[PDB]
Amino acid sequence: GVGISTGTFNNQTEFKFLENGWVYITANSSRLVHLNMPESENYRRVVVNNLDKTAVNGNMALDDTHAEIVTPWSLVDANAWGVWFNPGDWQLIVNTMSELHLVSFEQEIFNVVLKTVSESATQPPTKVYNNDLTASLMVALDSNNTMPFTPAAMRSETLGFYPWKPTIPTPWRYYFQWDRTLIPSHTGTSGTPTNIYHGTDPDDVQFYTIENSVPVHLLRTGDEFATGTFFFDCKPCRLTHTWQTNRALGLPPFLNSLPQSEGGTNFGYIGVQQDKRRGVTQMGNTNYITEATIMRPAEVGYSAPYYSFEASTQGPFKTPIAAGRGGAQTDENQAADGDPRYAFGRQHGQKTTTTGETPERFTYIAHQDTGRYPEGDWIQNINFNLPVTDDNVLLPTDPIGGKTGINYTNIFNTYGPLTALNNVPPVYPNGQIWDKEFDTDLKPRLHVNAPFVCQNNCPGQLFVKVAPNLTNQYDPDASANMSRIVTYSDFWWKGKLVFKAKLRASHTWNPIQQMSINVDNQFNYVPSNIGGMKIVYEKSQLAPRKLY
Amino acid sequence: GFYPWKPTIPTPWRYYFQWDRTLIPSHTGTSGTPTNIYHGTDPDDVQFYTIENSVPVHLLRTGDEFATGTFFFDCKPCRLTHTWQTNRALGLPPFLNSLPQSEGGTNFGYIGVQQDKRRGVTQMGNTNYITEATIMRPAEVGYSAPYYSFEASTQGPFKTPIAAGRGGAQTDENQAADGDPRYAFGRQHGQKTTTTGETPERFTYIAHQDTGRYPEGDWIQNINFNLPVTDDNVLLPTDPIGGKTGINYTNIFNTYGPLTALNNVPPVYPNGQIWDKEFDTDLKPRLHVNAPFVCQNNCPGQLFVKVAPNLTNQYDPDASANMSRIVTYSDFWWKGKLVFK
Amino acid sequence: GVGISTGTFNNQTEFKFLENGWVYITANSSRLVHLNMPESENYRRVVVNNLDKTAVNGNMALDDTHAEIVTPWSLVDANAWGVWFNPGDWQLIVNTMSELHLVSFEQEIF
């Protein structure tokens, strides 16, 4: 009833250790959530079109042109690592465990509260807030996944990462179909490259409403809403990085001459003429067998176009990359590897005392050396007469199509039936946790936004909405105003995410990478002179593995 | 060794230790010293193994013996037949309206329908031309791959491997575009055992299965398909790319795709590998080029031997100096059983 | 003990034919193996670096630079067709049979 709570706050993280080193990680998460009534109780089809920026020529990539359905509903998305784990938790997870399974997920909404403002009482005149006891909060759970999947992690719009700080849902909205052409150009190109918004292919129109798809529950103060327990099935996510590239696969060449004093240039030498060697290569011409020449069983990682933009029906988009990291010491190629860059604000990691509209950012460079360093690429002519002529080799220096700043590697692609890959590492805290699988007849070997993909069915999305609180004058047949009492709601959200992981074991003489503090660093994990505070990105695959 | 009556030996064991390394490519004309450095060792990638800490060690004296269990494999079957069909020979050939009427070497048969007045299906939305090189096929046999492509990551550059082959007609093959493997070996493994000299015997395996490419026959036409085609409307393997005499588009070309069909590598007798471990990658290769059998399972363990330290009477471990050991060596017999079905 | 053999030499290749034309090829292989004590009883981390060849320009493909752990252990590897089959065996296999399964593998030292 009114004066009786309907739930319990629990943001406790339990680690239940079992037999055969399987651990049963139960992550609890609770938040106080704040919610206002919709801007309007209507669904809207809105179009965005920034010709003001695209007609600039050489500005094709800044396209934001799209169409959208704006719903009066808000989404409660807790699909992000930072919702479930604090740094201390992650440390434990990452340093001590070898793989990670996604087991189950459940959530409930409780201690619902509704208050009306209204206002103006009296002189100076200030504002005043009263309870509307009979008022309702609409909750709807799309458990059939009828509706478009919109993970909020991509826009850094999930729930807050701090337990003691309140949070909010985000207004729900989704993509509506649109045709669109945009011909690329450069600064020199004059005239106007055609840049048009064609409209909407009727054969592709899908207008969804919560109301026609999902049962909605009305919750008053004394009501509570709980979901079942959803059980996952996915591949395990591994918490070890592979360090081997092709150049370190298999049996090393026997060294006939080993060093005889310590030091930094006391090298060992193979001791056989490169053309008098025994072994196997895939080069039918020469008898050279060198480390770059010697056959390897397959190919680790792959080369992909960068920065390639491709275009279909609805405009241009970047071509995504799987691998990374590929560069040597402190030098990479963040675009050839496709290392992701996260931008977020206060609620999700940025220092909460920071004023200003500018977000905090970082670029996740994985530990797994499976990417490329295209600067080191080349292509020789069939004859392999070497030292190689300028006419017989194509370097990443030699311009392509008569452009100084383009070389062959920008359009290069070495994916093939010998390509080997890892899945993306978890990015704490802003990374996504699970992601729906494309309903295409043939599917992606992975996703770049999340390590766990539900291929049969994912948990449904959770939607909330303040119930229409009408005044005494309401004429629906009038075009004019919907006059509603200004109403808003506070409700508590609790979730339980269960993982099951496996403990790692030492197979080397040496110790290995692990997180810690650090006299540097040490200050990213405590509040400040005022109420703190900050959460910092922090890797995931610290321990080395072994490809081969 | 490959000969039952001739003794043999193991090989000293050694394995890869991590290193960072950069090497920028260059040609003879190139000025300067292209950067060429050995950066060192990524500490996050350091793995030092010992037999001693990982594997139980048996001490065998004369009267002792050591036998392993029987390891059971599970892999796909390896096929001992080659395929000969390329796309140009898949399916129903076109009906001939004029059959030859005397035997001989140029008594060809003729289809007998104008190329633009023929029935059938193509993937060319423009023309009404249906020719054997144009007619649709259910998928694509074999694939085009870069050659000789070198790619580079963390530890230096390496050649890009190829799957298919052979693709050239008879006499002429592109041993690099098909990636036909070349084996080098000595006396113990095939070379005539009487031959002195450090120079190894060699061969290049050219498979029987016609699934490779002959890039000299490749080309790309412009969308309009106005033919005989203008020099500006076609890109040949003759036309230089990036302004280099010896490079054309096929050198960087890649037609691997969702319609690609492939076979696994054929066994290479006697120098070929038999089975091979699978990469512990989250996503795996569809095949390996060094062996026909790959263990998705777990593979038989490697077997290591070592002579026990036979010490003299003077041994001081606290001494930096030479470990003085009695000179010792061993003879032992090895028997194996490999069962196929 | 000392004066007593502990195994038997067998390099015989058996073809056991079954029903529905499945064959059961058991390739036996035996060798006398020779082994000396290690150069040193130690593990070594050795680096190879042939700038001598790579600095040449146009010689990138001749790179041999790598790092390596050198152990006092030796490896007994029989992973090669020639270890198990003579030419004649191979002829039989290749001419008369359509596919090949890898079933089992065991080995001993005696």
Add this chain to the structure above:
Amino acid sequence: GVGISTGTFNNQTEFKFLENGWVYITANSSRLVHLNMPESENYRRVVVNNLDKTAVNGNMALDDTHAEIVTPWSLVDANAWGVWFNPGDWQLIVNTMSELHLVSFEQEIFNVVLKTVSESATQPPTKVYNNDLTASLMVALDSNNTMPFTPAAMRSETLGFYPWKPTIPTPWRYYFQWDRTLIPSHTGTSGTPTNIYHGTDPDDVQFYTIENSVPVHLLRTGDEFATGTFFFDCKPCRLTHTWQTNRALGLPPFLNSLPQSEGGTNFGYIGVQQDKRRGVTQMGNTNYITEATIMRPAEVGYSAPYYSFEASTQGPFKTPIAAGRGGAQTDENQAADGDPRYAFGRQHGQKTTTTGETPERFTYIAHQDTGRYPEGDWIQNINFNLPVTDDNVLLPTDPIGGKTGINYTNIFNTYGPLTALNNVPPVYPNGQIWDKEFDTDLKPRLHVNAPFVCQNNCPGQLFVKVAPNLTNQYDPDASANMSRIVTYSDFWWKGKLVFKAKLRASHTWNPIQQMSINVDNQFNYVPSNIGGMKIVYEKSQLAPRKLY
């Protein structure tokens, strides 16, 4: 018999996980061990007397004067962390587990080899080594602890820490009673300070022999010897360090003025006059209640004399200290905290390529802040009239007994019924693991050389010795040389030490200290261009605890 092995080498470390997060660490260790025949087959009472160094005056601390029984036996001591764990193993233990039990210990000797040198033959001439098949190696296990406990860890004379490098036992010797007086002095003192070795108190004489106390087993090649499985019973050793000193126990004083801008001098203030404050102190005079005055429930750590030397019957010796560390930012009174210092050579950590007689060293400074910084000590007068008078306070500056470099803290002792302590942390790899308890009617609350103390029964010491291989010429009635065939032995030793550990859990928002590598550091855990190698000291109590 002859051609048949009697055991198998195993230096493998197994981690068996159970339920409720108990781990079952089974450490296996195997070594090849080398042993030459005794210098003589006799027991000897040798006296050492370096008057050469002690007559110097001011050289009291350099005393080596003692008596010793020298035995023809050698001792196989494996009591040191490095015998059982590689660094990688130790990493695992220290980073993921909260405590540690010592469960059981067994060992065996197998694959015995006996060879006689014997000798010249021929030109120029070199030596040759043959097997003596019928010869024996004597093995004796004193399982009743009849004989003096001599842990070799104290002299860095345990087995080797490297599995693939052979090792040796050490000649066994034990203390024999002796009287001895040495009066202390300084450089200025002349005349001759009485410095005498009085002899031996007959009432205290104990001459032990292996032969009369322990059954001796003769092992020829085909024999093997295994001990039983010994089960320990001791307290758990903890793998977490405490950080609270008295100044941080309990309820902090309420701040009435909290800072309102971030920064480094933006302090908060208690906001009440120090004499107008509420609370409890043990100072009956003043009404001052400050962080330095406010009562605490008891006392963490204790102050002890340094460098104190005390003297009894057999001479002077340092006074041992329990706690440590006590100083703040990178400066420790390594004497006031009794921080231990270890010396060792190649076999146990020093770089093995290093020539030269100088040992490698380090000083273990623990993580547990429970020591003292005596420079910060002082003593005020009963009246507590402050700011305080020079004659009303005693500082660590004011000299005692009129010596410039001596202050009160050097003779100070604040052990008391309110004293709280921890046991010593494990020192990897050179630290002792277990230690016997003193057979005194009253016992120490701990030992400083090792964390596990067997009050129970400790595993017996293992002694080996080459059996006397006589020549044909032997006359016992003759004074002349024992003529023996030159003989030495190779045998393998294998041990199994079992622990029981418990996995830790995250209790804080922040992550915590853990071992890793490190761009520094990274080279202490791999061999070199030649055969390495080095083992480096690395702490043990990395995760923080909570006293109160």
